[PDB]
Amino acid sequence: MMLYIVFILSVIFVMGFVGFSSKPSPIYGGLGLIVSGGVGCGIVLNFGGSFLGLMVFLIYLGGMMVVFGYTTAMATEQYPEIWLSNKAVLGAFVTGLLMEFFMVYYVLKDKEVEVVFEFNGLGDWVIYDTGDSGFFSEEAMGIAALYSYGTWLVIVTGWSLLIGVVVIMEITRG
Amino acid sequence: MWFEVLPGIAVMGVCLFIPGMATARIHRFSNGGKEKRVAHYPYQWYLMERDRRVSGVNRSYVSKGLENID
Amino acid sequence: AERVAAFLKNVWAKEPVLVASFAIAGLAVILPTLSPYTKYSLMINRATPYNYPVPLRDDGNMPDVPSHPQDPQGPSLEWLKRL
Amino acid sequence: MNLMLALLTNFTLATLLVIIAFWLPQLNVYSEKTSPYECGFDPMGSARLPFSMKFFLVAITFLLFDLEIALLLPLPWASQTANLNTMLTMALFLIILLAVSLAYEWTQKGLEWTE
Amino acid sequence: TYKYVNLREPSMDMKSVTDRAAQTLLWTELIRGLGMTLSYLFREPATINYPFEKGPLSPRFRGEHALRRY
Amino acid sequence: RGEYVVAKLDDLINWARRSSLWPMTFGLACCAVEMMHMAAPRYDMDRFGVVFRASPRQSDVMIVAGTLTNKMAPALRKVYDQMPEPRYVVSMGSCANGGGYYHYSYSVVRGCDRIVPVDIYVPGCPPTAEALLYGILQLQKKIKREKRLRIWYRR
Amino acid sequence: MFMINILMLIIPILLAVAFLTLVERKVLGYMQLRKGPNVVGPYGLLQPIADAIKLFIKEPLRPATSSASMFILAPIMALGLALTMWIPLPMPYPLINMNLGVLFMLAMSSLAVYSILWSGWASNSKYALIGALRAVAQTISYEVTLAIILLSVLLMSGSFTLSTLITTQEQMWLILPAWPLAMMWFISTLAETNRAPFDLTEGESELVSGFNVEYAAGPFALFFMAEYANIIMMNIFTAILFLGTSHNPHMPELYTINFTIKSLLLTMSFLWIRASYPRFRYDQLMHLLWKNFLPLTLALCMWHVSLPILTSGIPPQT
Ligand SMILES: CCCCCCCCCCCCCCCCCC(=O)OC[C@H](COP(=O)([O-])OCC[N+](C)(C)C)OC(=O)CCCCCCCCCCCCCCCCC
Numbered sequence: 001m002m003l004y005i006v007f008i009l010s011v012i013f014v015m016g017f018v019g020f021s022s023k024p025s026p027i028y029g030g031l032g033l034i035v036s037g038g039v040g041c042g043i044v045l046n047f048g049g050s051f052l053g054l055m056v057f058l059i060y061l062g063g064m065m066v067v068f069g070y071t072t073a074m075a076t077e078q079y080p081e082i083w084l085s086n087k088a089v090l091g092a093f094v095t096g097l098l099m100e101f102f103m104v105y106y107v108l109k110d111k112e113v114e115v116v117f118e119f120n121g122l123g124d125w126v127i128y129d130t131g132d133s134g135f136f137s138e139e140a141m142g143i144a145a146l147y148s149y150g151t152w153l154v155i156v157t158g159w160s161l162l163i164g165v166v167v168i169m170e171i172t173r174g
Numbered sequence: 175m176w177f178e179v180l181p182g183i184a185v186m187g188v189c190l191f192i193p194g195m196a197t198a199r200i201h202r203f204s205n206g207g208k209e210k211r212v213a214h215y216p217y218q219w220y221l222m223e224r225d226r227r228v229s230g231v232n233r234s235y236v237s238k239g240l241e242n243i244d
Numbered sequence: 245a246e247r248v249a250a251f252l253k254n255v256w257a258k259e260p261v262l263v264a265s266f267a268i269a270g271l272a273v274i275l276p277t278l279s280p281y282t283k284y285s286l287m288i289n290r291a292t293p294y295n296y297p298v299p300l301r302d303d304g305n306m307p308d309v310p311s312h313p314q315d316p317q318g319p320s321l322e323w324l325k326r327l
Numbered sequence: 328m329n330l331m332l333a334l335l336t337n338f339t340l341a342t343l344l345v346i347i348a349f350w351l352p353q354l355n356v357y358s359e360k361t362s363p364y365e366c367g368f369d370p371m372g373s374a375r376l377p378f379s380m381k382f383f384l385v386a387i388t389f390l391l392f393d394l395e396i397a398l399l400l401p402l403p404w405a406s407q408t409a410n411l412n413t414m415l416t417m418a419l420f421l422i423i424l425l426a427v428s429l430a431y432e433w434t435q436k437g438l439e440w441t442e
Numbered sequence: 443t444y445k446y447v448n449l450r451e452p453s454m455d456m457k458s459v460t461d462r463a464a465q466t467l468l469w470t471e472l473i474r475g476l477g478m479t480l481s482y483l484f485r486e487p488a489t490i491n492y493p494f495e496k497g498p499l500s501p502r503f504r505g506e507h508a509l510r511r512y
Numbered sequence: 513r514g515e516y517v518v519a520k521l522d523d524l525i526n527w528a529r530r531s532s533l534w535p536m537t538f539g540l541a542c543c544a545v546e547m548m549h550m551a552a553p554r555y556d557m558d559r560f561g562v563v564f565r566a567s568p569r570q571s572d573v574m575i576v577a578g579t580l581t582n583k584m585a586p587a588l589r590k591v592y593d594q595m596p597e598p599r600y601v602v603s604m605g606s607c608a609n610g611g612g613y614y615h616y617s618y619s620v621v622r623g624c625d626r627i628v629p630v631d632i633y634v635p636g637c638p639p640t641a642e643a644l645l646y647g648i649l650q651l652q653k654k655i656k657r658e659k660r661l662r663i664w665y666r667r
Numbered sequence: 668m669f670m671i672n673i674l675m676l677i678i679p680i681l682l683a684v685a686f687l688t689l690v691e692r693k694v695l696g697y698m699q700l701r702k703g704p705n706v707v708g709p710y711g712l713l714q715p716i717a718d719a720i721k722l723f724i725k726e727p728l729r730p731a732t733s734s735a736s737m738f739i740l741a742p743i744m745a746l747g748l749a750l751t752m753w754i755p756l757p758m759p760y761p762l763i764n765m766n767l768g769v770l771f772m773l774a775m776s777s778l779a780v781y782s783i784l785w786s787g788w789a790s791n792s793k794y795a796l797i798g799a800l801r802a803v804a805q806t807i808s809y810e811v812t813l814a815i816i817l818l819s820v821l822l823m824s825g826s827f828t829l830s831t832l833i834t835t836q837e838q839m840w841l842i843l844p845a846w847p848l849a850m851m852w853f854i855s856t857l858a859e860t861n862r863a864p865f866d867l868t869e870g871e872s873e874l875v876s877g878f879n880v881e882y883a884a885g886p887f888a889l890f891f892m893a894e895y896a897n898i899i900m901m902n903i904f905t906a907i908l909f910l911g912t913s914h915n916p917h918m919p920e921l922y923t924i925n926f927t928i929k930s931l932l933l934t935m936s937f938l939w940i941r942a943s944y945p946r947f948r949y950d951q952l953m954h955l956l957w958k959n960f961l962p963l964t965l966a967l968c969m970w971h972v973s974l975p976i977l978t979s980g981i982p983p984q985t
Pocket residue numbers: 344346347350351352353521524525660661663664667719720723724
């Protein structure tokens with residue numbers, strides 16, 4: 001059962017996506033996105049990406065906090081909608097959950113499934129690498145190379161972030 | 175007087191001492207009297223896995239020295 | 245110089261925090277070029293062996309490659325021990 | 328497995344304390360007791376009404392700056408490179424551009440809250 | 443007669459300006475405030491042990507009423 | 513023996529409640545100044561476990577320290593109702609007790625006990641800070657005598 | 668045995684938190700020329716026990732206008748995440764040895780903010796909402812500077828592993844070469860833990876009780892325990908970062924004693940500070956971080972990237 005940990009997290013990942021894609025109040029949509037960010041961090045961690053997993057969680061936690069502030073200012077109503085309060089929201093929520101439940105039930109029944117495209121269902125562990133014993137984290141080595149190989153990437157991202165500040169100032173100065 | 179604040183500080187100090195002391199002692203107990211092996215990188219985990227196989231009792235903290243080489 | 249010096253004494257009076265920031269950032273940009281120990285940073289980074297040193301096939305004509313690790317030939321770290 | 332167990336225990340312990348808190352005490356629920364608090368007088372309007380954010384521009388700037396730390400956090404590892412000439416230049420370039428971006432928003436009065 | 447409570451121009455000489463920079467950067471005046479509360483920590487408190495000790499009163503104190511006799 | 517067990521559990525919940533009385537930060541007039549002096553160093557109410565907390569949700573005692581007017585009466589009742597239970601009311605000073613100097617006024621409630629139930633009345637105009645403390649310790653002893661679990665056992 | 672190790676972590680944490688409440692009341696009391704608790708148990712030693720029992724037999728209230736599920740969830744999040752922050756702390760051995768322990772603590776601290784936002788929003792009352800949005804402002808103020816301050820310190824240690832900081836500081840405390848960063852770190856932890864003079868999300872004199880104004884009894888106690896747990900944890904983090912204790916592998920208890928004393932004194936300084944200063948205005952806190960610490964933090968982040976390289980003193984990766 002623990003061997004399916006990545007699959008179980010990916011099921012919760014989708015459930016969080018159905019949470020905010022059905023579009024209740026953005027307060028609850030933010031909560032759905034935070035759950036998916038956490039389990040998504042859990043998924044990437046189980047493939048050897050501790051830094052990537054933690055970083056995406058860290059980034060989305062800051063992002064959804066700003067979304068929370070903007071929600072209370074610019075996207076609120078007298079009766080914010082939970083999933084059960086609106087027929088359209090509830091229908092999308094249940095439709096997504098049922099589709100997910102069926103894909104999970106069948107892929108775990110046949111150890112395989114065909115939902116448009118063929119997916120094996122033997123447990124995600126089968127594809128893992130077998131032979132490693134280096135004295136370093138390969139993901140850390142690749143990320144650190146941003147500053148020696150990715151000079152060009154540094155320039156365009158650095159410039160884009162600077163222009164971003166300039167641009168938002170222009171856009172929001174009516 | 176001010177020294178009557180110490181008893182609460184002493185109680186607070188004792189409580190904060192226990193987690194560190196307990197963790198250190200539980201580690202020795204569960205690793206045959208030694209520090210818990212630290213595996214930050216795959217190489218260290220590989221050696222620990224080989225220790226488990228080499229132990230003969232499926233315990234990576236059971237060491238085998240020259241007595242095991244014929 | 246007077247205009248800049250008068251400008252310096254003004255920002256010390258008004259914005260000492262920003263004076264320290266620019267002073268600190270300046271030393272970051274400048275000193276690495278003036279430091280004599282900067283070259284060792286690359287040498288130390290280069291001398292750390294994360295990888296196995298795969299041996300070369302002795303073709304019979306590489307006199308500067310050691311046969312044994314304790315032979316004289318090859319790079320040495322005596323410079324590093326005295327650092 | 329140790330990490331998952333530790334998390335489960337922490338939140339199980341917190342949940343149990345909340346269960347005790349709700350099922351141990353004697354309750355006496357009635358309308359006036361559970362009405363919203365506003366210093367003894369009834370609230371005027373819903374608390375769900377829009378609450379203007381006067382630091383909205385700093386909040387958006389936080390998103391961009393929050394992402395810069397994700398670019399900078401790998402710096403301890405990048406310092407282990409043999410190509411230190413490039414790494415140091417690029418490392419300083421990123422921080423300087425962040426400082427320039429802060430300076431721009433500062434001089435253009437972007438850090439001042441709306442009145 | 444009157445006096446001004448807040449009407450003083452700070453000195454603009456180099457030593458004074460650097461004294462103020464140190465105060466700003468090194469929080470000297472905030473550290474001084476910490477010294478004052480520290481001195482109070484080591485003073486005997488003013489609390490009395492009521493009801494075993496009582497606040498002082500005088501013969502004129504006006505309390506509960508009573509009807510008297512010759 | 514259940515009688516023995518419930519008796520000891522009564523002592524524990526009573527002891528915990530009287531040892532941690534949190535009055536609501538709530539004062540009305542001059543009597544509230546003497547209440548400030550009870551929190552001041554000479555009497556240090558906090559040394560008894562008595563700690564002001566502003567929110568009614570986190571308060572155990574309402575000290576009605578001053579005159580209650582007709583205009584203020586609904587707000588006093590509101591914040592008393594918003595206190596969770598158990599809750600207690602200490603009436604401090606003549607005004608709160610029964611109207612006092614303003615008893616015959618058109619705008620004054622003649623005693624806060626017309627609006628809320630009262631556990632202790634502290635006399636005085638104002639009661640001294642020591643008099644109020646005597647009233648708080650009297651409330652503590654009233655809580656000590658409570659028999660909630662012993663009565664439940666015999667229901 | 669590991670389950671026993673967990674219990675020997677969080678039960679002591681809860682006990683230390685309970686008696687920190689006594690110590691703060693006594694320490695504040697004596698700085699205010701009074702005594703604080705000295706009746707409930709000798710020298711007030713039972714005062715925390717009475718308070719805890721009192722709150723948990725007090726009636727909890729679910730407000731009529733409140734969002735039920737979020738209202739209950741938030742205090743569980745607060746305490747559960749407060750305890751989680753302790754598992755990677757090397758004292759000297761961590762319960763969970765992590766590669767990116769610092770990055771784990773940053774992420775868990777960011778997640779804990781939502782226990783303030785959701786409790787305040789779920790209460791559905793004006794003072795609670797105002798308190799929650801102050802937390803949004805507070806996080807925006809300190810989060811960027813806090814991460815970059817850590818980065819600068821970690822460029823002398825070489826890794827995100829908390830145990831490496833013990834090795835880094837074997838010869839000398841990091842406060843010597845990084846006292847400017849230690850100063851800015853210390854203030855940031857006060858803002859991070861919502862402590863005076865940055866106690867804005869509660870802001871009693873302004874918002875009655877801010878975000879937790881609608882919470883009573885046991886649910887209120889959970890927020891209180893979480894806050895005091897974070898105060899101790901953040902000051903343990905500070906002691907490890909800047910006042911590293913020497914670790915003798917054969918006498919690990921000597922480390923614990925020395926490290927506990929440092930953590931206690933740093934915690935006392937939090938109580939000391941609360942007794943001494945007035946409160947910031949919450950826009951003035953934002954300007955403090957962004958217009959003062961951030962310029963200085965950016966400059967010092969540049970300096971600590973260059974300093975190892977120019978002095979040829981880059982730490983080992985492992
Ligand atoms: C940091 C953690 C701290 C946690 C501390 C936990 C508290 C430790 C101290 C426990 C002392 C015993 C609790 C007594 C308080 C009960 C509240 C009260 O006073 O009610 C008065 C009531 C009085 O009721 P009554 O019948 O006399 O009248 C009330 C009704 N009207 C208003 C109409 C008059 O007592 C009871 O009803 C029952 C008393 C039972 C005593 C045994 C307690 C059992 C608790 C289990 C409850 C079942 C749900 C599960 C809850 C979780 C279990 C842990």
